[PDB]
Structures are given as C-alpha cells and as structure tokens.
C-alpha cells in the first residue's frame, strides 16, 4: 500500500515534469535552425594513424595541450602519444589488462585508467626518477570503471557499473562524494567546462546532471530508448549530447530540461560508443558500431560527414581543446587523427 | 632537433618493449570463465574485481578470467571479452530449475554481436549430482523440459562404463539443449565444445587445451583462407 502510494506519487511527479517540459517546448531546435545554412560536406581525412596498441582500444582522452593524448587498450597498456609526430611518449603497463576508460589530467602530470578491476589507477607522469608509477589506486567502486575525468590533480570523478559515480580525493584515496540515482550501469561521464556540474549517461536510458560539490542529481534527462554508452557536454555547458545503443544521438539542454534534437538515420541501426562536440559545438561527432564515425550537424540533425576509417568497432572519440583534430580509437587496435 | 631525436629514440624503445610484450601476450591464451553461482566454475581446472587463474598444458599458458566483483548486469562488461580465444561456460547440469537460465545466458552469449565469433567450451558440471538426481527419481526433467519426454539418446552418444541409460539420456538431453542454440546460429565462425564433468575431474585443463587447439586451428584456417 505504501509502495503503491509512492509509485503513484512518482507517476504524478513524472507527469508533472513531462507537462512542464511540454509547456516549455514552444518550438523545436529543427525549426529555429531551419533557416541557417548547412555546414556543407565535412570531409575529414586521416592525418596520423597511431599504431602500437596490440589489442582493442577502449578509451582515449586528449590532453589540454591538444597535442598529447592517452589511449587505453586491453593489451594492458596505456600509451601516451605525441600526436603531432606519432611519437609514443609513455607506455604504462597496467596491473589489470581489462581497462575500459582513461583520462588525461588538465595539468598533464597525471593519467588515470580503470576497468574490470573496479579501481581507478592514477599514474604520475612527472616522477623524480622519470618512470611512470602508480601514484594512487582508487578502490571503492563495486562495479567496473567505465569513465573517469580529472577536475585537477587532486580530484577525479569516476563512473562505474555499480550504478554510481564518485568524486575522489586522489591524495586521500577516498570517495569524497558518491553520486547515486542511476538504476543501470553508468557508462560515461562528461565534466562541464566550469567543472561545477557533470552529466552521466547510464544503462537505464537516462542521463543525469549532478552537482559536483552539492552531491545530488540536479536533473534527469530521458528520451533515449537504450543504454547510453556515451555522453559529452556542449562547449557552453548549457547542453550535452548522448550516444546510445538505440542508434540515435540526442542533444539535451540543461536549462530546458528536455531533448532538443535526435540525430538518427534509417540505415543506422547500430549503437553509439563515443560522442564529442567540435569546438563551437556545431559538429557532433559520434563513433558507432558499424566501424564508422558520423559527423552530425548539431543544429540541423544532418549527417555532415562520415569518418569511415576503421576495420573494427569505434570505441572512443575525442576532440582537441583547440578544436584542431579528432582522435578516433577503435577495436582494430588503432587511433586515427582527423581534420 | 636533439630533443626531437631523443623523443624518436624514446618512442622506438617504447615500440620495442611493446613488441616484446605483445609477443608474450600473443603466447598466452585468454579465456573467459562464465557460469552461475551453483555451477562450480571455480573448481573446474583446480589451480577484488576480476580474478585470473593461470594454468599450463603442453607448454601452452592459459589465463582464465572469472569476472567477480560485478553486478548481475553483464551486457556491457562482457564486450571486453571480444578477443578471448574461448568462453568457458560452466553449467550446473543437476540444477534443472536454473538450466533454462543457463540456456538463456548461453543464448545471449551465442548471439551477441561482440561474442558471435568466440567459441564456447561448455562444461556440463556436476554430472555426479545429475546422475544421483536421475537415479533418485524425485526431480523430473519433464517438469522443466517437456520435450525430454520425446527425447531419445543419440546414436553418437558415448556413455561412461556402468552408466544408467536414463542418466545418459538426461546428460545428452542437456547437451542437446545447448547444442540446439549453438547450431541454430553462427555456423562457421564459432563452435560449442560440450564436456561432461564432475567436481573430482582432473582432465578439464586437457579438455580446454584440446578445444582451444581446435579453435586456434580454425582461426588459423580462416587466416589462411582455407576455411
């Protein structure tokens, strides 16, 4: 009776949220951007092919210098690359080879990885001896590590398959904040540009906007049909895109609290593993399971281009801070740079 | 161009170490151990987070990964095991009430896009418990699988010496329930190797070695393009 009452109250509250979202949905983003010109045909070419990983790559993260990048692959290796010259700067052997995520610190002094070991491993790239060692092991998640992102050299938000996210102090090794509310495996997280908020997409077909310091879920975004494998903020921080297994990308707005746009096509039936915006946010680049990447016009929902350069599943995709390039890392053990 | 040459030398040394580690990795056979809690998957070869068991047969090194420390939802972390040589699926063949669950799990393994190229070594464990359940007669498979009432033992079946024919019909029926799923899809890319096993069995590492040998033969045949 109590549970039934709470479930009817919850249904009324979802109906109220849906009616508020419908009330604020006076027009759509397709109609408002109907009169602007198309971006044309975006034809990126492979400029650098980062070779050296010998198993499937699961994740990649550009450094803030827009030159160095870290890649995680399930040969047990974090490789840090000078993408300008294809020179490998670091090869970090991992204790657990089943790595699913990696992160480059904004300072460039640290990298993180993690996966089926349920541990966020922080490696110091600036040791006095000059060798990359384990600076910290962040145990405490009871599920696989699916995404991690540094805020600085001391705090990192991780997302996990235990349906939670966590803000960690690296110096103490402790979860300062636990972000709960997802009912499926949290596959990806994206930090806001001010690093005050972060969105997390999970396997409950939902994304959640969380306050990093206040610790609760401020907003919940639904509209996707299947597991959200990918999430990325719009560069102003007022919107974000999600990639899911329902073969669609969706642009949600924070202040409108609803989906603004769906990026899909009838010939696309495979899920999205990675999403990233360009520097202006006009291009939404998404990596797919049909071994290709699609550049979408983020304002007009038109497929602007196809990065068809991978013989296996595109698992990760990242855009440089200066917007110069896109790195797509795939299950064919290669990362490719495109512009 | 001195620090550039130093970076190139560092990258080539890193390439050398990566090549050596990749050859060492290419010599280890990666296996994914899957099974329910009652399956007895930990006692198969008898040798937190994901656990790794390293055993050796005929100088071939096998790393069998039992994925503990995760929730019951597996659709995302099992995609990590796209490139394993085989999935070792252990089933408690005596637990009839969960047999269909194991079958569904096998089906979800067999038909998954990122798992449809991976052969499965099927260990129908607890054959002694299955034998004493069949000889006891209290629990009937027809209460959980009505088609067992219409099932006959195959002519190709090789029963153990001193095995009761009802026990043979039961174990080969469970094997055929899994083989129906394995033969319904994915013909050519991956195969299911069934093995009847107890908990005292000590030849499961040899069975894994022979099945992995067959799997590697067929992958090398596809690489040669003979198959």
């Amino acid at each position, epitope marked *: 009776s109590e549970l039934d009452q709470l479930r009817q109250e919850a249904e009324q509250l979802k109906n109220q949220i849906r009616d508020a979202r419908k009330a604020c949905a006076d027009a759509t983003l397709s109609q408002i951007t109907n009169n602007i010109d198309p971006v044309g045909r975006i034809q990126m070419r492979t400029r650098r092919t980062l070779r050296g990983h010998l198993a499937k790559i699961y994740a990649m993260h550009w450094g803030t210098d827009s030159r160095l990048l870290v890649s995680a692959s399930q040969d047990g290796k974090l490789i840090i690359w000078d993408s300008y010259t294809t020179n490998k700067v670091h090869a970090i052997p991992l204790r657990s080879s089943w790595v699913m995520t990696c992160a480059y610190a904004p300072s460039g002094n640290y990298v993180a990885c993690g996966g089926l070991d349920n541990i966020c491993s922080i490696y110091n790239l600036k040791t006095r001896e000059g060798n990359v060692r384990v600076s910290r092991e962040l145990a405490g998640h009871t599920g696989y590590l699916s995404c991690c992102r540094f805020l600085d050299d001391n705090q990192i938000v991780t997302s996990s398959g235990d*349906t939670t996210c966590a803000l960690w102090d690296i110096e103490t090794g402790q979860q300062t904040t636990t972000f709960t509310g997802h009912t499926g495996d949290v596959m990806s997280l994206s930090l806001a540009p001010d690093t005050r908020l972060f969105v997390s997409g999970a396997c409950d077909a939902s994304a959640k906007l969380w306050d990093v310091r206040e610790g609760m879920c401020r907003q919940t975004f639904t509209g996707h*049909e299947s597991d959200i494998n990918a999430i990325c903020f719009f560069p102003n921080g007022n919107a974000f895109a999600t990639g899911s297994d329902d*073969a669609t990308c969706r642009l949600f707005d924070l202040r409108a609290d609803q989906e603004l746009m769906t990026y899909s096509h009838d010939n696309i039936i495979c899920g999205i593993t990675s999403v990233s915006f360009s520097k202006s946010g006009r291009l939404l680049l998404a990596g797919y399971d049909d071994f290709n990447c699609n550049v979408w016009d983020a304002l007009k929902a038109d497929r602007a281009g196809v990065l068809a350069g991978h013989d296996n599943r595109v698992s990760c995709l990242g855009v440089t801070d200066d917007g110069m390039a896109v790195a797509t890392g795939s299950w064919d053990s290669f990362l490719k740079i495109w512009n | 161009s001195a620090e550039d040459k130093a970076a190139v030398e560092r990258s080539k040394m890193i390439d050398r170490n990566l090549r050596e580690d990749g050859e060492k990795a290419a010599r280890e056979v990666k296996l994914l151990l899957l099974g329910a809690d009652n399956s007895g998957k930990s006692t198969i070869v008898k040798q937190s987070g994901i656990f790794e068991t390293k055993f050796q047969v005929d100088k071939v090194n096998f790393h069998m990964f039992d994925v503990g420390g995760q*929730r019951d939802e*597996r*659709r995302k972390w099992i995609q990590c095991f796209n490139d394993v040589t085989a999935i070792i699926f252990v089933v408690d063949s005596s637990d009839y009430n969960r047999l269909q669950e194991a079958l569904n799990l096998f089906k*979800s393994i067999w038909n998954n896009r990122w*798992l449809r190229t991976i052969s499965v070594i099927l260990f129908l464990n607890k054959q002694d418990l299955l034998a004493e359940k069949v000889l006891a007669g209290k629990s009937k498979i027809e209460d959980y*699988f009505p*088609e067992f009432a219409r099932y006959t033992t195959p002519e190709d079946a090789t029963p153990e010496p001193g095995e009761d024919p009802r026990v043979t019909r039961a174990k080969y029926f469970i094997r055929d329930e899994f083989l129906r799923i394995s033969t319904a899809s994915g013909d050519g890319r991956h195969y299911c190797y069934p093995h009847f096993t107890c908990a005292v069995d000590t030849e499961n590492a040899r069975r894994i070695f022979n099945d992995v040998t067959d799997i590697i033969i067929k992958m090398n045949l596809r690489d040669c393009g003979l198959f």
Partner: nanobody, 128 residues
Framework: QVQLQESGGGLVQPGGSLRLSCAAS????????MNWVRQAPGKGLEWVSD????????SYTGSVKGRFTISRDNAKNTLYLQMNSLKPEDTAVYYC?????????????????????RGQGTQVTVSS
C-alpha cells in the same frame, strides 16, 4: 522515458486463465525482442517467454510450454501473455522485460534484480 506498464494480474483459481497486458512507451516497440519474466515469492527472477521483433520467433520456458502464449501487437505497442491452465507454482510477480538493445537476438540481463527496461510487474496469484 522507457516505460513498461503491466496489468491483467490478480487472484485466479487453479486451472484458470489470465491475460496479462503490458503497455510500452518511450521506445519503438517493433525494434525490440520482448520478454515475460517472473519472480515467485522467495525466488529469483525467472525468465518465462520471449517473442522476437516481428513476432515470429517465440520461445517459452519449459514449465509454461503448452500453457502460456506470448504475443505482441506492435501497432498498439502492447505485449500479451495468455496464461491458460494456471498452476499454484505460477503464483509470481510477472514483469514485462524489454531486451536492452534494438535489432538484436541476444537478450542480456532481463532477469537481473535491478534491470532497467523492465516494468514494475503485476501480481498473479494462483490459489483456491
């Protein structure tokens, strides 16, 4: 929002018949294989039946074969389970479970404790 709402359950005499319906919203119903799972008192989530995207591939667990009939109407986005010849071991909370990814034949995790593409379920009680 992916929503699965189940109805039709209730008290029913042994040997009686019941028709469970589920109304699906928030997803293209015809793109997913659909499931009926159930959870008896004191037991875990047990899979009962699946029906494919078109409605052609239909399978049941063996305890309900010949007694249960799964069907789908993709036009009204509704999943049906016709439960004839009901036994007291069919007393369970029945849940409509969508398979997690569209256009797939594998159906992972629909019997997991906290699976997301599953409704709140309806109680079917088979007692005299």
């Amino acid at each position: 929002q992916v929503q699965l709402q189940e109805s039709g359950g209730g008290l029913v005499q042994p040997g009686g018949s019941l028709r469970l319906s589920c109304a699906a919203s928030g997803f293209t119903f015809s793109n997913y294989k659909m499931n009926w799972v159930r959870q008896a008192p004191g037991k875990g989530l047990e899979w009962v039946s699946d029906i494919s995207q078109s409605g052609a591939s239909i399978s049941y667990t063996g305890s309900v074969k010949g007694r249960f009939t799964i069907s789908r109407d993709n036009a009204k986005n509704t999943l049906y389970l016709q439960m004839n010849s009901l036994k007291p071991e069919d007393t369970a909370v029945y849940y409509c479970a969508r398979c997690p990814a569209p256009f797939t034949r594998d159906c992972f995790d629909v019997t997991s404790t906290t699976y997301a593409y599953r409704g709140q379920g309806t109680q079917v009680t088979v007692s005299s």
